[PDB]
């Protein structure tokens, strides 16, 4: 049970440094090499490089000039630096374990979640959460929709769960939008039962990492 | 150094027919290659290493063939759930390297979608702007046309839709279409429909709403 | 009578799983289980219980009125307030023999209804209280706060008041419903009066037969012969004085 | 009016006004109450006077 999760800004100032941490619970960094790979957009995978607290290191020669990976044995942190980030720099960033040897040589099994790290100046905005109420009058079947639109927020990463986890079948969180102010826009839905409109309620947990903001909010007919 | 050249980047196929995708490589790789299964925003889940050596937990068809320049992955009947990216991996010589990665989607019979119409909250309102969705919910031609009418005014602009990637389960697809509008904020107009037009549609579905 | 994995409250107030046992048998000696599965699944606790436990060793046999006013009413409040617990066969529904009262045109007007069996058998009517999370959850279920349920009898009147008060997770539900009972005789009324928070009942038992039984717990199932002797162990064949048996 | 409110117990409670015995100079009288706070369980105090 290894467990590898990033941690990440999700902006940094073009030409700056970009600080990327994975924290490791279920293994001792002291004992295992650590991979950063990147993934812009769409994109394939990009593998920036391999550490290991007492073993030399090796960099994807693309980047070399400018990673640097660390380890911190006390809080087990897995670091990554990228002086000098362009604009191609913006990417989704995932830490994983490289193996022990094996008669299968080396394997990755264990993957982070991966953070998303754009390259801006822009600065930090937080969501705006309204409901999307259902009209319970129209006849619609047995069934009815409910949302959550989340609009103007300017670090792409917004997460959206629905009464705290419970909710999982029928959910589509659509994919964000760029409008014209610069700002992107997520709508995400639940298909329900008509019928359980009146006795159970229903519930959004919105949570915009980089700006820090939380909002959870009811939809009531 | 060596580069991974995939090949279809692009699939489609319905449930339990047999899918191969081809990685071959700029130089030998002997038997360093591994497979990855991206899901849609998910880390890759290594699916073959050795280039044949099925990790535990990978189905019983899932297969992967090859030696020196090129490669196999084989399903023997695809299921919903193998809708993914998927990734070929150099773990021969450093630097390490992938594939482009190919695009494994799924045919599925014609699935009408449900349409629903969503008004714009009021505390949006009050802030100043106001926001109309269409919801399309299921439906499997992905292609599928959403008009905005406004008092039977067509406006192409001030919309922008969004698409879902394929579900596990039904391998359908919906869509948001939202109508951003705040002239009078949406004052000036008595009715708001969706002329939605589908395949699975005889004649185009249109839902409305004439709130404000 | 065989409870399989049915609490009595659960065959009494009829929770979706093991509704196999709405067409009760005349005879029942009661064999229960010591925890069993399917319970109070909306979480809930029920007042007096093992009174009413006492009560059904002398009874024997039931008849469910299927006169409590009914569904069909819907003067007031709404008859369609199924809950995503007590699941039947998997499928989210709520107990039938009470039921979920929701308040109609977000107006919650108090109902004084009221029933006298004028039967000749005595009844067992039942009913509850929803003790909700959020004053918002309770403003959404009834818009009157601070609410109020009345039992009016010719022996016993109770004055109910919710609890308001987010509790632990339970079949996803911290909300709690409390089950009352009550001895209706023939010719006996009672009345009902509620501001909100009512999960008023549609059904009720008729005491057909109150012969001689026990609700003795046995994890044991049934296995089909017929003895003058039973025990949550077993059941004796020969006929001496004494036994160390149970 | 003085009302408990707990996960288990609520109780709402009215003072007696009434003069009795001189007791340490003070005829007005104290009930102490107690109930046992589970970790996780709350209490709320809401008190006319
Ligand atoms: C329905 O509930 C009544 C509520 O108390 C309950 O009380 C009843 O008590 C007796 C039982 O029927 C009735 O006495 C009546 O006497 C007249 C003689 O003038 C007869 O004609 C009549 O048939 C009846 O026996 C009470 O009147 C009645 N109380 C009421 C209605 O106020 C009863 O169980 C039942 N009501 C009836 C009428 O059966
Ligand atoms: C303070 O009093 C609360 C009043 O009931 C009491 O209830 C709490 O119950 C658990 C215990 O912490 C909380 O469950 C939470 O679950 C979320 C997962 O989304 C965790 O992130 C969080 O840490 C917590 O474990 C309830 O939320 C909480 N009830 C409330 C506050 O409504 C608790 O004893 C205590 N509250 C907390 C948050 O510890
Ligand atoms: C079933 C019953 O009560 N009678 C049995 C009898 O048939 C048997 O021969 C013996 C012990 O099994 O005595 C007792």
């Known amino acids: 049970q290894v467990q590898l999760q990033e941690s990440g800004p999700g902006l940094v100032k073009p030409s700056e440094t970009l600080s990327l941490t994975c924290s490791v619970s279920?293994?001792?960094?002291?004992?295992?090499?650590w991979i950063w790979i990147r993934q812009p957009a769409g994109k394939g995978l990009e593998w920036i490089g391999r550490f290991y607290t007492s073993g030399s290191p090796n960099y994807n020669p693309s980047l070399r000039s400018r990673v640097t990976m660390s380890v911190d044995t006390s809080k087990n942190q897995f670091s990554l630096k990228l002086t000098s980030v362009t604009a191609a720099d913006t990417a989704v960033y995932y830490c994983?374990?490289?193996?022990?040897?094996?008669?299968?040589?080396?394997?990755?099994?264990?993957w982070g979640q991966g953070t998303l790290v754009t390259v801006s100046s822009a600065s930090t905005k937080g969501p705006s959460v309204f409901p999307l109420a259902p009209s319970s009058k129209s006849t619609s079947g047995g069934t009815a929709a409910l949302g959550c639109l989340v609009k103007d927020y300017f670090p792409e990463p917004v997460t959206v769960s629905w009464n705290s986890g419970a909710l999982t079948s029928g959910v589509h969180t659509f994919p964000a939008v760029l409008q014209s102010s610069g700002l992107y826009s997520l709508s995400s839905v639940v298909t329900v039962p008509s019928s359980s409109l009146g006795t159970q309620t229903y519930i959004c947990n919105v949570n915009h990492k980089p700006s820090n903001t939380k909002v959870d909010k009811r939809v009531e007919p | 150094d060596i580069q991974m050249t995939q090949s279809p980047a692009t699939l489609s196929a319905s449930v339990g027919d047999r899918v191969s995708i081809t990685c071959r490589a700029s130089q030998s790789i002997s038997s360093w290659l591994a497979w990855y299964q991206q899901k849609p925003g998910k880390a890759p889940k290594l699916l073959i290493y050795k280039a044949s050596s099925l990790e535990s937990g990978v189905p019983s068809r899932f297969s992967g063939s090859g030696s020196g320049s090129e490669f196999t992955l084989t399903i023997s009947s695809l299921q919903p759930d193998d809708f993914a990216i998927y990734y070929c991996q150099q773990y021969n010589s450093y630097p390490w390297t992938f594939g482009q990665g190919t695009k494994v989607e799924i045919k599925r019979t014609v699935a009408a979608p449900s349409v629903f119409i969503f008004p714009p909250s009021d505390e949006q309102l009050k802030s100043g702007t106001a926001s109309v969705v269409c919801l399309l919910n299921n439906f499997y031609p992905r292609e599928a046309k959403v008009q905005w009418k406004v008092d039977n005014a067509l406006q192409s602009g001030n919309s922008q839709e969004s698409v879902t990637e394929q579900d596990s389960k039904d391998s359908t697809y919906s869509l948001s279409s939202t109508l951003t509008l705040s002239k009078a904020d949406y004052e000036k107009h008595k009715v708001y429909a969706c002329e939605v037009t589908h395949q699975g549609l005889s004649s185009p579905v249109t839902k409305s709403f004439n709130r404000g | 009578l065989i409870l399989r994995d049915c609490s009595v409250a659960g065959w009494l107030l009829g929770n979706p799983m093991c509704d196999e046992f709405i067409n009760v048998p005349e005879w029942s000696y009661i064999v229960e289980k010591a925890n069993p599965v399917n319970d109070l699944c909306y979480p809930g606790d029920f007042n007096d219980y093992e009174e009413l436990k006492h009560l059904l060793s002398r009874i024997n046999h039931f008849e469910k009125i299927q006169i409590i006013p009914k569904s069909s009413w819907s003067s007031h409040e709404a008859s369609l307030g199924v809950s995503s617990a007590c699941p039947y066969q998997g499928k989210s529904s709520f107990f039938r023999n009470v039921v979920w009262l929701i308040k109609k045109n977000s107006t919650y007007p108090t109902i004084k209804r009221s029933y006298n069996n004028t039967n000749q058998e005595d009844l067992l009517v039942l009913w509850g209280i929803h003790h909700p999370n959020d004053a918002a959850e309770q403003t959404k279920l009834y818009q009157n706060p601070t609410t109020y349920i009345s039992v009016g009898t010719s022996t016993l009147n109770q004055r109910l008041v919710p609890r308001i008060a987010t509790r632990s997770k339970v079949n996803g539900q911290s909300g709690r419903m409390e089950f009352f009972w009550t001895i209706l005789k023939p010719n006996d009324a009672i009345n009902f009066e509620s501001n909100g928070n009512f999960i008023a009942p549609e059904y009720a038992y008729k005491i057909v037969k109150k012969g001689d039984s026990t609700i003795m717990k046995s994890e044991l199932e049934y296995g089909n012969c017929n003895t003058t002797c039973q025990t949550p162990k077993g059941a004796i064949n020969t006929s001496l004085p004494f036994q160390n048996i149970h | 009016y003085i009302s408990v409110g707990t996960s288990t117990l609520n109780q709402r409670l009215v003072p007696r006004i009434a003069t009795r015995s001189k007791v340490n100079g003070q005829s007005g009288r104290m009930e102490f109450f107690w109930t046992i706070l589970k970790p996780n369980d709350a209490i709320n105090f809401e008190s006319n006077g």
């Open positions: 994983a374990r490289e193996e022990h040897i094996t008669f299968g040589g080396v394997i990755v099994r264990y």
């Open positions: 279920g293994a001792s960094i002291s004992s295992y090499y």
